[PDB]
Amino acid sequence: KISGGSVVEMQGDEMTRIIWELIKEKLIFPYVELDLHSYDLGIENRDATNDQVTKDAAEAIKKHNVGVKCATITPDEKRVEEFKLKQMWKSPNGTIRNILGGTVFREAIICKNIPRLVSGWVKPIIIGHHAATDFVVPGPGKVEITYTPSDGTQKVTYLVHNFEEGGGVAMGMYNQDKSIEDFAHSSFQMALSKGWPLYLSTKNTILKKYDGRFKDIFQEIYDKQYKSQFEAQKIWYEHRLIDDMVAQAMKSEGGFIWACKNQSDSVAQGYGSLGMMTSVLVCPDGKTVEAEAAHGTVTRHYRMYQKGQETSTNPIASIFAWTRGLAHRAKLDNNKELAFFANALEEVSIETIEAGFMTKDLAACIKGLPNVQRSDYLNTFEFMDKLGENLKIKLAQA
Amino acid sequence: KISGGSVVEMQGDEMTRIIWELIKEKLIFPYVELDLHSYDLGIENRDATNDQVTKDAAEAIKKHNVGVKCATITPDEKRVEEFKLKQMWKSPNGTIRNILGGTVFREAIICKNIPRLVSGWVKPIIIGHHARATDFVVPGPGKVEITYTPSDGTQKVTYLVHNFEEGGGVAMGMYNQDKSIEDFAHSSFQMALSKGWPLYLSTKNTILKKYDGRFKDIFQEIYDKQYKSQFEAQKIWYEHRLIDDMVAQAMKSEGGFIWACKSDSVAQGYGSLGMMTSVLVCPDGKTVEAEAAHGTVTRHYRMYQKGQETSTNPIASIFAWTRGLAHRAKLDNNKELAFFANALEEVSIETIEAGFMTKDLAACIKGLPNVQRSDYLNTFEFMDKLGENLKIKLAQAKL
Ligand SMILES: NC(=O)C1=CN([C@@H]2O[C@H](COP(=O)(O)OP(=O)(O)OC[C@H]3O[C@@H](n4cnc5c(N)ncnc54)[C@H](OP(=O)(O)O)[C@@H]3O)[C@@H](O)[C@H]2O)C=CC1
Ligand SMILES: NC(=O)C1=CN([C@@H]2O[C@H](COP(=O)(O)OP(=O)(O)OC[C@H]3O[C@@H](n4cnc5c(N)ncnc54)[C@H](OP(=O)(O)O)[C@@H]3O)[C@@H](O)[C@H]2O)C=CC1
Ligand SMILES: CC(C)[C@H]1COC(=O)N1c1ccnc(N[C@@H](C)c2ccccc2)n1
Numbered sequence: 089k090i091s092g093g094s095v096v097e098m099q100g101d102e103m104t105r106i107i108w109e110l111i112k113e114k115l116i117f118p119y120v121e122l123d124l125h126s127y128d129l130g131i132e133n134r135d136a137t138n139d140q141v142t143k144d145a146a147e148a149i150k151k152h153n154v155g156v157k158c159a160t161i162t163p164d165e166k167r168v169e170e171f172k173l174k175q176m177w178k179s180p181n182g183t184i185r186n187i188l189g190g191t192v193f194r195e196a197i198i199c200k201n202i203p204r205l206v207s208g209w210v211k212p213i214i215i216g217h218h219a220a221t222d223f224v225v226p227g228p229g230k231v232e233i234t235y236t237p238s239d240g241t242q243k244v245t246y247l248v249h250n251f252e253e254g255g256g257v258a259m260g261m262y263n264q265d266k267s268i269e270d271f272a273h274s275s276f277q278m279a280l281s282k283g284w285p286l287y288l289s290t291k292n293t294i295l296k297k298y299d300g301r302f303k304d305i306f307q308e309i310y311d312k313q314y315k316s317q318f319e320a321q322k323i324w325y326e327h328r329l330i331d332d333m334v335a336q337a338m339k340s341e342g343g344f345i346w347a348c349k350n351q352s353d354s355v356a357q358g359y360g361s362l363g364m365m366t367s368v369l370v371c372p373d374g375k376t377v378e379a380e381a382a383h384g385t386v387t388r389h390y391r392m393y394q395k396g397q398e399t400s401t402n403p404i405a406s407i408f409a410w411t412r413g414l415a416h417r418a419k420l421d422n423n424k425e426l427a428f429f430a431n432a433l434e435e436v437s438i439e440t441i442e443a444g445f446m447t448k449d450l451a452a453c454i455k456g457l458p459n460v461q462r463s464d465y466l467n468t469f470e471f472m473d474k475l476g477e478n479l480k481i482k483l484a485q486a
Numbered sequence: 487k488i489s490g491g492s493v494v495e496m497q498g499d500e501m502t503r504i505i506w507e508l509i510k511e512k513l514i515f516p517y518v519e520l521d522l523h524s525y526d527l528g529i530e531n532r533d534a535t536n537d538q539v540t541k542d543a544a545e546a547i548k549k550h551n552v553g554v555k556c557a558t559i560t561p562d563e564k565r566v567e568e569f570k571l572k573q574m575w576k577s578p579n580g581t582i583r584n585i586l587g588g589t590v591f592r593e594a595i596i597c598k599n600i601p602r603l604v605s606g607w608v609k610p611i612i613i614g615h616h617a618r619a620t621d622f623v624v625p626g627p628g629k630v631e632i633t634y635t636p637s638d639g640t641q642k643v644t645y646l647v648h649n650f651e652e653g654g655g656v657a658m659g660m661y662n663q664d665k666s667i668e669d670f671a672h673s674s675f676q677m678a679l680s681k682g683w684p685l686y687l688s689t690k691n692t693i694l695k696k697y698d699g700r701f702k703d704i705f706q707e708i709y710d711k712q713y714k715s716q717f718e719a720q721k722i723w724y725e726h727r728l729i730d731d732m733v734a735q736a737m738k739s740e741g742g743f744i745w746a747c748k749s750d751s752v753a754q755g756y757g758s759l760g761m762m763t764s765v766l767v768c769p770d771g772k773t774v775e776a777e778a779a780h781g782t783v784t785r786h787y788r789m790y791q792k793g794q795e796t797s798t799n800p801i802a803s804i805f806a807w808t809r810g811l812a813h814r815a816k817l818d819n820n821k822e823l824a825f826f827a828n829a830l831e832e833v834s835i836e837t838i839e840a841g842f843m844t845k846d847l848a849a850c851i852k853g854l855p856n857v858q859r860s861d862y863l864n865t866f867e868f869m870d871k872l873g874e875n876l877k878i879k880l881a882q883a884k885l
């Protein structure tokens with residue numbers, strides 16, 4: 089088997105837990121040997137360890153640079169009573185990002201037989217977003233926002249609003265330079281890693297100081313640190329006003345990175361393609377990545393699975409979490425064998441869908457869900473078997 | 487002719503001004519007579535009156551309740567050079583909106599043969615936008631605070647925004663008045679009742695629990711005290727959504743709801759700004775100002791001056807009139823004018839659905855680069871065809 093090296097894996101919850109184990113059993117473990125740092129972030133085990141497993145998983149990603157994560161339940165009030173949780177544990181994803189830093193980039197997987205929301209988008213678009221004290225104003229009065237330098241030599245007082253005719257609400261927000269810089273570095277690394285050009289969108293016409301700082305810091309870091317590496321790959325970096333970016337992006341064919349300063353997984357859910365959207369946290373050092381599906385645990389399918397009904401859950405996004413993590417491991421290690429495997433598994437997935445073997449969501453995307461009949465699609469396990477069979481052929485032929 | 491009553495009109499600039507006159511002369515005046523209160527907000531008349539004609543027009547709307555407005559040039563540094571005018575006057579639409587107040591609602595015009603960005607959207611969705619931050623650079627370490635000082639001399643309240651311990655960054659403050667939020671709510675309920683469609687408000691009140699929670703609370707309070715009964719009598723409702731759920735729900739919907747949001751760009755990228763209409767809906771439920779959501783279409787106006795054939799879409803400008811006229815008809819219980827407004831909209835939709843369209847519409851079918859001259863009509867050709875179809879429909883209606 090391929091010697092794969094150090095990968096941090098995080099097990100999860102409900103329907104994605106099922107698919108995750110299938111991915112390891114049928115598509116990864118038959119071909120790759122991993123020095124696997126495996127952490128169980130299932131809700132019950134987070135409860136039993138008082139969420140310590142989540143913090144330990146994040147520490148492992150930092151040490152070993154490659155994380156692949158299965159979808160996890162984020163507790164709310166009803167989860168607390170469903171599992172009798174000791175408390176409403178915080179989102180594992182927030183815990184991990186707070187420890188790793190970095191920027192989340194989402195990317196759709198595109199197949200030629202599958203409609204796109206914007207049909208001219210024939211190459212994927214990779215979108216990353218940059219990730220407040222608010223209060224109630226009880227009645228008339230001035231709200232002001234002040235800055236006091238550490239030396240105390242000055243004191244600038246900006247008027248937010250003079251409320252004259254009632255109360256309302258107000259808020260202050262901020263960003264540290266370092267956070268903007270990290271967002272730049274991650275974005276530049278994303279673009280170099282994929283070999284695609286990079287756009288930053290802001291509303292610097294309106295937030296001239298706040299958003300102009302994003303623009304200035306991106307351009308300064310580009311000029312000092314990345315411009316040669318971009319010109320070596322014949323890619324480029326530009327700023328856009330968000331108004332123009334949206335119009336230009338919709339007239340584009342795709343194949344660019346879009347760093348967005350002001351969600352896309354919500355459009356995917358509305359469109360019915362969450363199972364085809366992957367996600368990757370990109371740390372600004374360019375070394376550490378955490379890959380995962382953009383969707384959740386798919387509870388509604390899992391209740392169906394629990395009741396004996398047939399499930400047609402799309403495993404592609406979860407598969408591409410593995411391939412993206414392994415491809416990155418291959419890049420850090422110059423593992424040609426691994427790189428070939430990771431790429432081959434992505435090709436197999438797209439070839440299989442493009443030959444008409446797909447889950448119910450993809451069939452509904454072609455035909456519309458009302459017109460979908462059961463023979464137009466495979467169920468979760470049929471689809472995985474077909475992918476396993478096509479992966480066996482593809483790897484054997486080389 | 488049909489008696490129309492009192493309508494405030496605002497003429498405008500460049501390509502829209504030319505479309506504007508073709509509409510009155512071919513589509514409105516042959517069949518309707520109006521107590522028309524006209525105001526010329528063309529850039530020249532706006533300079534030559536120190537932008538006074540603009541605020542007179544806004545007062546006329548306040549008084550007469552119905553305004554219809556052509557698109558107007560907003561001045562920038564290149565505009566002042568163009569007409570050698572005396573100042574970089576403010577947007578006529580900002581002037582108008584702070585005299586009247588109220589919420590801008592946008593609505594696309596749908597035709598069966600013109601593809602939609604979301605195929606399942608067969609009925610229009612109406613988006614209501616609430617519409618000022620103070621932002622600055624933080625140059626180095628220090629404290630950013632935001633404070634509230636009551637106007638009655640009582641104790642100021644201080645909120646820590648951030649201690650910058652190393653380096654600087656940026657900060658800003660934002661605000662919203664209860665009255666603006668209450669007006670937004672009223673305008674939104676009014677708009678949902680006039681159309682007979684349910685209403686959704688979207689916020690992110692899970693993160694900004696005080697700021698956005700204020701919007702959610704004001705909408706709900708006002709809904710219960712003054713609107714729930716009238717809503718339940720048109721089989722519609724009001725509900726609040728987190729923005730994530732609202733985006734998903736909306737894309738799975740069929741359309742036909744009001745979305746109060748706490749859009750133009752997507753229309754421009756999709757190529758459908760010519761099919762996008764707008765209406766300023768004041769909180770009283772009596773005053774509207776209707777207009778195309780697009781601008782003066784400068785780029786086509788230049789082709790018009792250089793003797794080039796143009797194919798600028800007039801539908802959204804026509805619907806400024808029809809929506810203004812429909813609202814004027816509802817105020818006056820004028821059934822004859824309500825019929826004309828509705829019929830001019832249906833004529834417009836049907837003409838397109840029969841294959842007679844301007845070049846942008848043809849491009850939604852064939853693809854932006856793939857239109858040829860035989861696929862569409864030019865601006866004046868299209869107006870004639872509307873005019874002919876409008877005559878035929880009004881003749882066949884007296885039965
Ligand atoms: N990164 C993470 O760990 C995330 C975890 N979550 C967690 O997931 C749980 C459930 O969240 P929920 O709001 O239902 O969001 P999910 O994304 O889990 O599911 C939402 C809907 O999108 C469709 N969908 C999502 N994934 C697939 C797929 N792989 N194949 C086919 N269809 C798919 C299904 O729609 P349909 O019903 O129409 O088939 C599904 O019901 C929650 O506990 C939440 O905390 C949520 C987001 C991220
Ligand atoms: N409420 C108002 O009065 C508004 C006025 N304006 C003003 O209008 C002027 C021009 O602004 P601009 O940025 O060009 O915005 P416009 O909305 O006038 O035009 C933008 C582009 O969108 C397309 N488009 C818009 N309307 C139509 C239509 N009716 N038929 C066909 N295509 C259309 C055209 O694209 P293509 O180039 O592909 O043909 C046009 O070049 C400015 O002076 C601005 O201040 C702007 C917004 C609102
Ligand atoms: C609309 C989107 C959910 C999917 C479904 O259908 C498409 O055409 N989609 C495409 C097509 C290419 N590239 C993407 N990338 C993602 C990250 C994206 C999300 C949101 C906006 C832009 C871009 N999405």
Ligand SMILES: CC(C)[C@H]1COC(=O)N1c1ccnc(N[C@@H](C)c2ccccc2)n1
Nearest residue numbers: 592593594602603604610611749752753758
């Ligand atoms: C995408 C949009 C520009 C037009 C063009 O294509 C459509 O199918 N569009 C539709 C279809 C129904 N309803 C709308 N309403 C507008 C106000 C809107 C704009 C933006 C978002 C939501 C809703 N737009």
